[PDB]
Design a protein. Structure first.
Length: 462
């Protein structure tokens, strides 16, 4: 992706978008009990912790586009993945408005706490002023969609979240690109059944883990991924995407039965108009992280990408023996023969992608079930039930999270959610976690599950 045009919003008649400039994150009562290094992301240019230019830092992810046609490797990659998705009988019929807004199996209700986007944010109109959980009212929403239409600017927010020392200093805060309520609803009508099918079928046919529950899903992953593991991280995946990858996505969608017109919303994602505080800008390429479907669409594109690279480097490859699972940029995969991920990564550079294989690196001469990670978690087979696999979030990451809060009123929910992650690290680790929690008076006011209870519920869940 590449920023093609930026100018002061007032020159185009847009008001300044007044977005949060000060973090909601504050040290929790556990800030001194546990160790950590992370701090709230930089949200504004004047932050005294900056060791770089903020506005340049947050937009540096837009590294450019490779301008190429959909080549022979991409075409075969699209065909192969499309054949898998054909197995799922995805409906391209529009999803009913009420189902797409207020909830249905496989598609949770539109989140009422996130930004309604433009123009609502300039008018002080919130999602709850238009929508109502209790009534499922669609009347005001239909008025608003008729009144303002579709293809509205996206509003860029700086994500308020903990970041490493280096990412604070470098100003590498992440951005959230909020679609207008109008476009979110319209995309959920157009693609809602696709979203539903993906959410209900995480695994190696969708090649997707979007919506998965790691407590359940991680025992299935080694059954699905039979061979020599391959795994990748990317640097700035979303913003690195060039328009050719969106063209591949449109081709895949059409093979699923979507009309050319129904794929027009992919152009809205690819060639996109954004408002950031007092500026507005156009991007050619780049997935606007935060719009409807971006995790699922990122995952589908990653399925095309990896196949393309394998086809290009290993002309003799058999994709029918390849398996992969993606969550956006994150990939875990396998093939029955060893594959040199460093060759795939160099091939990816020719397509405008910045890939880092999970193996060396170093300390990792070979990706194994011992050292591979997915969604930030390791894999550890249970010692007693070897066919059940624990997702293992590192205790260091849990410690980082528990030391801050965006609202101490949610302490009970926050700590409990962390307990549900922590116990997979083992009983001694969990008991120490609980001891430290209880070393602050708040900690003794919380309902904390016992280890044996967490283990018993986990075993029973299968």
């Amino acid at each position: 992706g590449e920023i093609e045009f930026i100018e002061s919003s007032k020159d185009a008649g847009f008001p300044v978008i007044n977005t949060p400039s000060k973090t909601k994150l504050e040290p929790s009562v556990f800030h001194q009990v546990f160790e950590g290094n992370k701090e709230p992301a930089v949200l504004r240019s004047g932050d005294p912790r900056l060791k770089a230019n903020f506005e340049e830092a947050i937009f540096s992810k837009y590294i450019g586009n490779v301008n190429t046609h959909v080549d022979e490797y991409m075409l075969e990659a699209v065909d192969h993945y499309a054949g898998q998705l054909a197995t799922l009988d995805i409906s391209t019929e529009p999803m009913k408005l009420e189902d797409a807004v207020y909830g249905t199996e496989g598609l949770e209700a539109l989140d009422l706490t996130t930004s309604a986007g433009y123009p609502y944010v300039a008018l002080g109109i919130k999602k709850r002023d238009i929508l109502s959980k209790k009534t499922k009212d669609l009347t005001k929403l239909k008025e608003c969609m008729d009144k303002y239409g579709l293809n509205l600017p996206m509003v860029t927010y700086v994500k308020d979240e903990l970041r490493s020392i280096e990412k604070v200093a470098k100003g590498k805060s992440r951005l959230i690109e909020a679609s207008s309520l109008n476009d979110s609803v319209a995309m959920r009508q157009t693609f809602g059944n696709l979203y539903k099918t993906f959410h209900l079928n995480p695994g190696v046919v969708t090649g997707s883990a979007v919506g998965c529950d790691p407590d359940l899903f991680w025992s299935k992953i080694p059954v699905m991924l039979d061979g020599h593991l391959i795994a990748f991280d990317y640097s700035g995946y979303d913003a690195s995407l060039s328009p050719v990858w969106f063209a591949c996505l449109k081709m895949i969608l059409e093979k699923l039965g979507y009309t050319h017109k129904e794929t027009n919303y992919i152009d809205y994602l690819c060639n996109s108009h954004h408002l950031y505080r007092d500026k507005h800008y156009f991007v050619r390429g780049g997935m606007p992280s935060g719009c409807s479907g971006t995790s699922i669409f990122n995952s589908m594109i990653n399925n095309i990408i990896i196949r393309t690279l394998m086809l290009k480097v290993y002309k003799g490859i058999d994709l029918d023996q390849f398996r992969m699972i993606a969550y956006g940029d994150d990939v875990i995969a396998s093939y029955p023969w060893p594959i040199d991920a460093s060759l795939l990564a160099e091939a990816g550079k020719g397509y405008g992608l910045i890939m880092t294989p999970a193996d060396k690196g170093e300390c990792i001469n070979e990706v194994t079930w011992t050292n591979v990670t997915f969604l930030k978690r390791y894999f550890r087979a249970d010692e007693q039930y070897p066919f059940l696999v624990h997702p293992v979030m590192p205790m260091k990451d849990i410690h980082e999270s528990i030391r801050w809060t965006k609202d101490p009123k949610n302490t009970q929910d926050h700590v409990r959610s962390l307990c549900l992650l922590a116990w997979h690290n083992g009983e001694h680790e969990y008991e120490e976690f609980i001891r430290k929690i209880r070393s602050v008076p708040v900690g003794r006011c919380l309902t904390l599950p016992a280890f044996s209870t967490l283990r018993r519920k986990w075993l029973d869940s299968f």
